[model samples]
Target: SGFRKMAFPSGKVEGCMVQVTCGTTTLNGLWLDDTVYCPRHVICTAEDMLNPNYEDLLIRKSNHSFLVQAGNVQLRVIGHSMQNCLLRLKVDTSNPKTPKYKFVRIQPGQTFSVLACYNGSPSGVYQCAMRPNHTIKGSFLNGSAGSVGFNIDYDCVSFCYMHHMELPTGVHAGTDLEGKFYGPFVDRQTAQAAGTDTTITLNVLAWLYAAVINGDRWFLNRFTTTLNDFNLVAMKYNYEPLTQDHVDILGPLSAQTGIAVLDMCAALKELLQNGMNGRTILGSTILEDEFTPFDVVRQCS
Candidate 1:
């Protein structure tokens, strides 16, 4: 009846230790496949499993999530809670009024994972209840089930991230921010030192729009060099580069006196909105009531 010491990645080096049984027995440690013992890697990079939003921040920090070889998202069940019954997972793909429950299982207070997709919704809510008591899909969403089981809504868990506002692409923000930021690097430094992070974020985003409109591919080139970086930038910004999302009406193409650029005006307007996440940064319209501090760094900045 002795214990074996193990190392964990909870920001500590060698504090983890576990017990070992002798004679004829087996051993298990957290049931995590990301362990280096058997040579099975976590598969996805730190950013790969990210939820493209705040929910991902928790999962990423806890290392409580992973990705399938094919890149589908997954959740590492650190524990279980199933209304005194068995717990199952149903990834609602369609998310229509009638959600399409695709895959799930009966699990307990142990380690498990859930494979899911973008699912056409940024924040796909979740619930857990007794299985035998209910069987309808819509009932799950409405907070009511035909079964006399317990229901727990994940709305409380949403606190890990913002409810709405801002964009979800910072995994590469630092990867490109300093190099691509064309806002007079000196001014940026001064802004960071003298002003706030929102000031820097908003002003620099404005400059990016300026750089793109002027056909100055120099700044854009910082990221456009590789398809992966380009794709990452595009995905993070919530826009398509070099396509519809890339065009701006404020440039020469802007519909001026002779150039019938009415359509281009919309393009420029769209670019502006995209940069600001369709909200105004002027006068500090923080929308404190309806929005949370969306970007962590941006919020602190």
Candidate 2:
């Protein structure tokens, strides 16, 4: 499709073919497809390509699916250069001839309160343990500056639209997780009929007494199986992948006589509470020492 005169948000026109000088990498291509957008909003360089009036320096809209609650904005920074340490963003909203910068620390979710920030500080620029001042290897902080009239950094930015935001956007789901399932209530009657082990053995006499008081051992009998199902549910309550939120509809076997199918579930709950909680079982799931991403997510977006 050979497109026509270059389109702009406004009904304006510009040269389709132009040369962009981004340092050693010269860009000689169509503005329709070759415009290089920066993450910075204001011009920090004289050789930048974006127009402050029409071009956006954002890397992506609204940090993808990461939601920022009302009264605040989410500031993001790429920090493979540092780990388990501190990373900061210097953002200030006070517009002036010389703009402002507010210093704030980045957290695990790469999110934090903007109001919590203090006066901007020049930091994160340290000698990369792997590389020094030249051809930096491990991690480095270069507050490199770009431009229409003012310059913006390609490395650090928050969506300018977030400040004067509008209506709520809807969400849809699509989780590629292999096999996922959910069932809210486990039916007790059906569980017992299938000889499902819903064991619960806590002072058989006490449980029997409670049943006796209700004049219904059947009701108390259901607990043994129900509890087992419940134990299994809690074991996998926490699962990850930030795009979606899930908890395993979240255990196993055993024996208790006259106690009537109570020990099986009691035993299973003890495993997660003991073996898992104690790291005996959880230790083997690869999650104990594994680097599974900590997800602060809910309902796939």
Candidate 3:
């Protein structure tokens, strides 16, 4: 939270000397050897360097390793005021194929915490790099941004390790409803009266019979999970669903099997209400205008 200054090694090329300087109060230096090539130093005003802190920003040796601990290290920008700044972290190791580097965008007045690692092997020098808007690269030498290297200690574990170990596996896994009974044979007209009514009836019957045979209390829980999974996968793959086509296809299916549809909807509603104790069933525009419980039951009757 005080003034800090970082000086590149003297007599070096314009873009060949990078230095990591902590604030004046917590003055610790992580200077790259003079042999490293430094990039352009973006300066910030003296007013901008006041009250610097890096408490919550993450520090990892590799993107896959545990976060480094917070020690007495910090960085702040100096010189002219600028906005919409971008910072990058690049890593170079013995392996040529595995380039470890990332870029972060920051606002003019924003500050960030960072962990700097120096030293390359066990029993070698180890230090923390903490700074804001400063550059650090993982390399193999004492100075070059392309050569300052360090071996990631295997002692640290990823956050996922602890989370997976502590949580129960089957918390969301619900009953499977395959090869179940067909219907509730209440009047067909009653079932097809409204989409919601039709779906509810079909769902209730399917769920009851599925529960009876499979010894599971939930209905279509796996189906819901599968749909969600597909949605995520599609998004990741940059694929979009044919919404109009899907509705067109299901429209006829709903008409043909109005009774079954109604039953299915009812069963899902019942499960949400009773099993999950959910008070409201939020649906999208697809179902909001097109379907209702009364329509399905009426059609079936």
The best candidate in terms of lDDT: 3
Give stretches of model 2 more than 4 Å off: 1-32, 42-275, 280-301
RMSD of 1: 22.5
Task: For candidate 2, give the lDDT of residue 110.
Answer: 19
Number of the top-ranking candidate, with TM-score as the measure: 3
Candidate 3 structure quality by residue, lDDT tens digits, 146-229: 112121213221100000000022111000011111121111112111111111122223223323233333343433223344
Write down the worst ten-residue block by lDDT for model 3.
158-167
RMSD of 2: 24.0
How many residue pairs clash in model 1?
Answer: 4
Clashes of each: 4, 19, 64
- Per-residue CA lDDT of model 2 for 1-301, tens digit only, reads 1111111121111111122222232222111121212222221133332222212322322222121111133222221111111111122221122222222212111111111011112112211110011111111112221111111132222111000001112111110011010111110112111111111122222223222332333322233445436435443633111111111111000111233333333433444354533232211322121111111111001
**Model 3: how far is 125 from its true place, Å?**
27
Clashing pairs in 1: 133-147, 197-301, 249-268, 255-261
TM-score per model over all chains: 0.14, 0.17, 0.18
Q: RMSD to the native, candidate 3?
A: 24.1
Q: Against the hidden true structure, what lDDT does model 1 obtain?
A: 0.21
| Model 1 / residue 183 / CA error / Å | 29
